[PDB]
Amino acid sequence: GPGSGFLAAALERIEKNFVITDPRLPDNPIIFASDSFLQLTEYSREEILGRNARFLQGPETDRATVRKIRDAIDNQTEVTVQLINYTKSGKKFWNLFHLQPMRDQKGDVQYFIGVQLDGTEHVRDAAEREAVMLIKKTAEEIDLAAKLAALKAAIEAIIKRIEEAEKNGDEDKVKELREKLDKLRKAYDRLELIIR
């Protein structure tokens, strides 16, 4: 899956509410969801994976706030908003939501990270600004962990290609691919140390 590197393994036990979406697939589906997200929303992983996150919206959701998310995704920018969402039971909650693109080493947007902080009320003022700093710091910790997981998945994918080329006696291909593997390994090791 698009989530096999996680991300799932790298991501889902982080005790934060988040999803990862893949904007390079139809309708930017959720490809990973944290265990905590499923408990918040009360949906199962199988109900959520492969669907767009908009299912959380309902009758009182501010459509102009939703458009600010829409525009940030289209523009590939971060955004922080607060909007009304509903659990599977129809329980209303306020979702203080932070989106940010996750880039690969070339700077291209590979995934979106979305971090939720649920509450009973629309927060403002110092309470809001603090909650925003929590979810931004959480998003940064997910971004680095997910980037490391994506380098590990790239290393596994190139080792498969190297073995295929070795089986086929494709030695110019082996040479090319082993140089790429050496750069991926260096990148992986560098980022591993930073977050160690």
Ligand X SMILES: Cc1cc2nc3c(=O)[nH]c(=O)nc-3n(C[C@H](O)[C@H](O)[C@H](O)COP(=O)(O)O)c2cc1C
52 binds ligand X per the rule CB under 6 A? yes
Query: Which residues within the stretch 60-99 sit at the binding site for Mg ion (CB under 5 A)?
Result: 73
Q: Is 59 helix (H, G, I), strand (E, B) or coil?
A: coil
21 binds ligand X per the rule CB under 6 A? yes
At CA 16, angle to CA 15 and CA 17, rounded to 5? 130
110 binds Mg ion per the rule CB under 5 A? no
Nearer to ligand X, 6 or 97 (CB): 97
Query: What distance, in Å, lies between the first and last C-alpha atoms of the chain?
Result: 27
151 binds ligand X per the rule CB under 6 A? no
Say if residue 99 is exposed, middle or buried (CB neighbours under 10 Å; 0-12, 13-18, 19+).
buried
Q: In terms of Cα–Cα distance, which of 81, 56, 61, 86 is closest to 71?
A: 81
Nearer to ligand X, 20 or 162 (CB): 20
Binding segment for ligand X among 7-15, 107-115, 160-168, 177-185 (CB under 6 A)? 107-115
Rg of the chain, C-alpha, whole Å: 19
Interface residue with Mg ion among 28, 36, 87, 110 (CB under 5 A) is 28
Query: Which residues within the stretch 110-129 sit at the binding site for ligand X (CB under 6 A)?
Result: 112-114, 116
Q: Minimum CB separation from ligand X for residue 69, in Å?
A: 5
Which of Mg ion, ligand X, none binds 56 (CB below 5-8 Å, type-dependent)?
ligand X
- Count, in order, helices (H) and strands (E) of the chain: 6, 5
Interface residue with ligand X among 34, 82, 95, 138 (CB under 6 A) is 95
Q: In terms of Cα–Cα distance, which of 106, 98, 94 is closest to 68?
A: 98
Distance CA 195, CA 184 (A): 17
Residues that bind ligand X (CB under 6 A): 19, 21, 28, 52-54, 56-57, 66, 69-70, 73, 83, 85, 95, 97, 99, 112-114, 116
